[PDB]
Structure 1
Amino acid sequence: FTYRGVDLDQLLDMSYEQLMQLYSARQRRRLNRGLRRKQHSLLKRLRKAKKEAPPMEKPEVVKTHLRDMIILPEMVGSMVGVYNGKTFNQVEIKPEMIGHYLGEFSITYKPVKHSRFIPLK
């Protein structure tokens, strides 16, 4: 795997201020406006859930409503169940999921899935 020519290890080493130079324009604008208290809270929660995970299989489920959360490179490998309005959907955090919001991975609507008269006399 590589993202904009940059591998995951130095992505985790990559700083917050010039992480915006590989992200997109909406992405860069959002990171310039700064993450609020809920996003930092869920960052701490994900880091804690990754903390006491046993080192052989994936950590436990973290459930949230934060659909406007962006996937950051530190989240890669977390088990996040995001709300769609009715239920929670659990998703892997893959390395190539970096540029997309969390709310894209829990669709809030179901797809739409939708005898002639003949006279005898």
Structure 2
Amino acid sequence: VEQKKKRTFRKFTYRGVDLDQLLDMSYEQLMQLYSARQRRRLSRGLRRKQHSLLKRLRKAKKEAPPMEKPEVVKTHLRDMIILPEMVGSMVGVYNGKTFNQVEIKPEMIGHYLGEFSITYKPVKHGR
């Protein structure tokens, strides 16, 4: 549960930056490079004091053995675009009722965690 040539058959650039190079990159470069919505998240949001969770993201990745996914990293926030150091964590994403644990991969880079967690039904009416 980690970086490139693994959890990626969807290859080259997600928005303008190749995920193959991106996992060798830092995300301080990725906000500069072809990631405008992520740029507005990483420059204006600017590392938004979820550091204890960000520590826990790097704690549970460290505490679990690296051939396996982390144990649990729950967040309340769902506005998180997956960073190359984030890739691999099984991130509990809260939708205001329930935590949704998502392993985050080279393909999912550029996508918010509220894009894999849902707050909404595929609407039924008896349907």
Q: Shorter-chain TM-score category?
A: 0.7 to 0.9
When the two structures are superposed, what TM-score results if normalisation uses the length of structure 1?
0.76
CA-CA distance at 1:94 after TM superposition: 1.3
Q: Choose 54-63 or 28-37, whichever is displaced more.
A: 28-37
CA-CA distance at 1:75 after TM superposition: 1.1
Q: Which has the larger helix fraction?
A: 1
Distance 1:114 1:26, change over 3 A: same
Higher RCO (C-alpha 8 Å, min separation 6) = 2
Greater CA radius of gyration, 1 or 2?
1
CA-CA distance at 1:92 after TM superposition: 1.3
Distance 1:109 1:59, change over 3 A: same
* Partner Cα distance (1:74, 1:111) in 2: 32
Percent sequence identity over aligned pairs: 98
* Partner Cα distance (1:83, 1:22) in 2: 29
Distance 1:13 1:61, change over 3 A: same
Q: Choose 45-54 or 32-41, whichever is displaced more.
A: 32-41
CA-CA distance at 1:37 after TM superposition: 4.4
Distance 1:11 1:114, change over 3 A: same
Runs of 4+ residues deviating >3 angstroms:
1-10
Cα contact 1:71–1:101 (8 A) shared by 2: yes
Q: Choose 33-42 or 46-55, whichever is displaced more.
A: 33-42
Aligned CA-pair RMSD: 3.5
The gaps in structure 2 that reach 5 residues or longer are 1-11
Match of 2:33 in 1: 22
Distance 1:33 1:48, change over 3 A: same
Match of 1:60 in 2: 71
The gaps in structure 1 that reach 5 residues or longer are 117-121
* Partner Cα distance (1:32, 1:98) in 2: 17
Distance 1:33 1:91, change over 3 A: same
